[model samples]
Target: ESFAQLFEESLKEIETRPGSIVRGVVVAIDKDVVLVDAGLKSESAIPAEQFKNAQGELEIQVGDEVDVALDAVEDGFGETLLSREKAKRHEAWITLEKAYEDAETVTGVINGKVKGGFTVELNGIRAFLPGSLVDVRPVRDTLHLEGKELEFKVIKLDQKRNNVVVSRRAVIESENS
Candidate 1:
């Protein structure tokens, strides 16, 4: 059977089980639980743990709408399971597809400096901005780029390979031309 057909069958058979993954939107927020409307019979409850950071403090609140995948319906309950991480990944794929189409200068915020490159968060996509491409005059403190925002040219990208290599040097060259 096709993937969708199999998935539908699984949902039908295991309804309210953890195996079913569905999308939802945050419609309401309470103290530690965020309510998500997944078009199902009941609104999914997003636990505070799902919104917590490694530091153990909650980082998300109401009004921050996002996509989510059902981890599993709550035990004995039919509510769907949801994952913030999965949702973020799904949303990022949409953005990566758009970036692939444009091949234009895309920008990202420097999350931090890494070995031989500055890590960037481009439209929620993580990419490596090599040190060699950071500046024309040579870089003294790559850390200066941390938390800073910059643009890059989509020099090479292969969706199938999940290899998206960008370049600040390319953007500079394009600017001069």
Candidate 2:
């Protein structure tokens, strides 16, 4: 569970098998697979699907370091069961404390358009910037924000509840400071 091993099997365990948190740098980008520095012999890879951009293009590149949460050990492909997006999301989830303390706004790039809202990328965590929260005025179309970058304020957050709500309204208020 600890990121002590750096073997292929270790990467598999960290990525595919139930494992613990690991840190590394990006080393390669092969279509949907992104190889990252494992601090071991071989680096692990993040599934290419995890880095899709607003235009649906792969947005990841080499030499970018990232943290990742291992989902499960690899089944048969002999690779790790890793998710860069997951790690980014986990980081965003954890970052609430500092943001709350500093009263700072978090920014994200709009990634996907969804029912009722758009997905905002807050360090890879898909924080829902609801249509109502997307702008000062009521939005007629949430899809208009897709691929846009914006700032948001923590309007509602309860770590125990696993509920973190962000608002553009708060962001607007913060900008005046």
Candidate 3:
């Protein structure tokens, strides 16, 4: 193959490669960035803060495999723009969509107590776990449930309105039978 032909082939491959989500391995962790080898020609680095878990602690280490979203093939500095949080959020949305369709359950942490319900965070997105749907038995106070991670069933999903309603009762009922 000629030099021009090889360059054309490379351009075609890049054009066809849609950057969305990719599985990557953590190669290094810097003070403010986490370098990842995302199977691309170049390695990508995401913010170290994005590697935090629900407890707000760095949950990743070198040699750990992670899923990352390719924000850009090449940024201004010639580095691949990667985001672990975005990838997790995108994955969660896809999983929630499928769970909603297939009637599956998801695990979430109760973050705070709200007016009519408690705020349960499911993969970064805040979902409403209504008081009535909290359990088969009614409880006077849900404050005690805060910070507790539990399984929930996605009952209502409104993407346009940016709302998600979950039910802990469904999981409890299924367990009882």
* TM-scores for the candidates: 0.45, 0.42, 0.52
- Candidate number with greatest TM-score: 3
Give per-residue CA lDDT, model 1, range 1-177, as digits (tens).
599999998878657544446556777777667788777878878665444445232455455555566655345343224465456766776666766665677777777677887777776557777777776767586346468778877656676666566777667765775
TM-score head-to-head 1 vs 2, winner: 1
lDDT for model 1, on a 0 to 1 scale? 0.67
* TM-score order of candidates, top first: 3, 1, 2
RMSD of each: 17.6, 19.3, 18.4
lDDT of 3 by residue, 93-151 (tens): 88888868757878898887789988899986789988777776676663465787889
Which stretches of candidate 2 lie above 4 Å from their native place?
1-91
Q: Which ten residues in a row have the lowest lDDT in candidate 2?
A: 49-58
Task: State candidate 2's TM-score.
Answer: 0.42
For candidate 3, the per-residue lDDT at 90 reads 74
lDDT of each model, Cα atoms only?
Answer: 0.67, 0.64, 0.78
lDDT score, residue 156, model 1? 61
Record all residue pairs in model 1 with backbone atoms less than 3 Å apart, i.e. clashing: 18-72, 70-81, 71-81
Best by lDDT: 3
